[PDB]
Amino acid sequence: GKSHGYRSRTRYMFQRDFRKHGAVHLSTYLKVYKVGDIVDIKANGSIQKGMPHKFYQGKTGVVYNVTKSSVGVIINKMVGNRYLEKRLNLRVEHIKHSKCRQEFLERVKANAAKRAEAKAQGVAVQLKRQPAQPRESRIVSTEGNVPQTLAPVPYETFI
């Protein structure tokens, strides 16, 4: 018959990695999570308690509950034609903070600093990001850079 267990098809997903097996380092236990933090989920195969299901591997969610050794995380799961709210109790070995959130907060504080310093002059702050604009005019010189003519190479076996 068919087989769809709780950890089916999780072979390479829950292998550890090359040459970093063994016990886990103490930074994962010394990291501090608060309610509202945004965290990434990546399971550790060395810890069998508090494991996430294989669906939530690589998923990103929001902390809603902090307990003794675990963290409650909220994920949005697509079921059919809508998203449902899923609450997960995961031990802290299987989560880490999302770095995109702290990058955005750094942008927020630097952006507020720019607005605050330029508010003393009113110099059209222009605080929105802009994407890659087309590159403008330039003059390239041939002083020591005379062009070298290239041609297609004929065919050879090369074995």
Partner: protein, 58 residues
């Protein structure tokens, strides 16, 4: 009389007819599943805060 077993044909079209609407998020989400020792203190903290604000703006 064998028949077709399973397919996922037309399913994404059926889903995207009326969209995959994101769930509605709210200020003050539900406190169910939150730790009872936290909620038991949170009730008294909000009660004291409401009493202090009522006495301030009475």
């Amino acid at each position: 009389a064998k028949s077709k077993n399973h397919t996922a044909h037309n399913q994404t079209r059926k889903a995207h007819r009326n969209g995959i609407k994101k769930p509605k998020t709210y200020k003050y989400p539900s406190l169910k599943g939150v730790d009872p020792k936290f909620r038991r203190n949170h009730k008294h903290a909000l009660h004291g805060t409401a009493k202090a604000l009522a006495a301030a703006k009475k």
